[PDB]
Amino acid sequence: XXXXXXXXXXXXXXXXXXXXXXXXXXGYSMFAVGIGALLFGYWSMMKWNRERRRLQIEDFEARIALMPL
Amino acid sequence: KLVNQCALEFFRQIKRHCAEPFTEYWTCIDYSGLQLFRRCRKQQAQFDECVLDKX
């Protein structure tokens, strides 16, 4: 009996298949989150600066109140 | 001369009545840097409330 190297292909490994595809981001939907984070960013920040004004006037009031200084 | 004399009159009134909230508020302001009112507003609630009994 002769024994040589046997042939096997099975699945053929798929000859040239695309793996690159669009994922997560679509296009217009990313701008809704992108610019949406900006509008949420300013509104949250400016409310803190209005709360800073409560401290600001109260800080300068200490100088006016102190005349024996 | 009247300014410094009235200054002693202000601090003596706090030392006589409601001294416990005043000392606790004084320890809060010096433990931090120069926030003055930040991270000390919770201890500020103990203050003024005792003083509200007086005029």
Dist CA A11 CA B6 (whole Å) = 98
Cβ within 8 Å, pair A68-B4: yes
Dist CA A60 CA A52 (whole Å) = 13
Q: Please tell me whether residue B44 adopts helix, strand or coil conformation.
A: helix
CA angle A56, B35, A59 (to 5 degrees): 30
Dist CA B17 CA B54 (whole Å) = 9
In this complex, the residue of B3, B36, B37 whose CB is nearest that of residue A68 is B3
Distances (CA, A) of B43 to A12, A61, B38, B39: 75, 20, 11, 9
Question: One-letter amino acid identity for A26?
Answer: X
Structure method: cryo-EM
Instruction: Of B8, B17, B7, give the one whose Cα is nearest residue A65.
Output: B7
